[PDB]
């Protein structure tokens, strides 16, 4: 076109394979951020949960630049760390990990099968445990 831009005046970057966005990093980070119910990421809430698909698709924003890789490593991570929950979780009629936190009042159905997930996240581990304590 007439306007032609480029790499010229978008930040000091490009030319060093490829490289992700703002709209897909940021964003991606942040409702990753979400997922954690602190800055810590030692603990996770489960409402981001359903945003996990979506923490999937601002992976998928970082799909195709580098950061994917990165981010692909936090939200694959996130993702285990909410799908662990989830794991054990669903094996309770009730969640049994919500906001980082186990919910002791849940109730271990008579699916509940359990594994000693290891997200990577220790406190989460240690609250994936919780639940399967109730398990």
Request: hydrophobic share 25%; no cysteine; proline share 0%.
């Given at each position: 076109g007439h306007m032609q831009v480029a790499r010229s005046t978008k930040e000091?970057?490009?030319?060093?394979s490829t490289t992700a966005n703002q709209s897909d990093v940021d964003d991606f980070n942040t409702l990753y951020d979400a997922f954690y119910t602190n800055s810590n990421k030692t603990a996770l809430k489960n409402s981001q949960f359903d945003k996990l698909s979506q923490l999937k698709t601002l992976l998928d924003k970082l799909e195709?630049?580098?950061e994917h890789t990165l981010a692909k490593s936090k939200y694959d991570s996130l993702a285990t760390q909410i799908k662990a929950i989830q794991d054990v979780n669903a094996q309770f009629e009730k969640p049994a990990i919500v906001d980082g936190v186990?919910?002791?009042?849940?109730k271990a159905k008579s699916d509940a099968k359990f594994t000693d997930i290891k997200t990577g996240n220790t406190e989460l581990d240690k609250v994936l445990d919780k639940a399967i304590s109730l398990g």
């Open positions: 000091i970057e490009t030319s060093q195709g630049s580098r186990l919910d002791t009042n849940a």
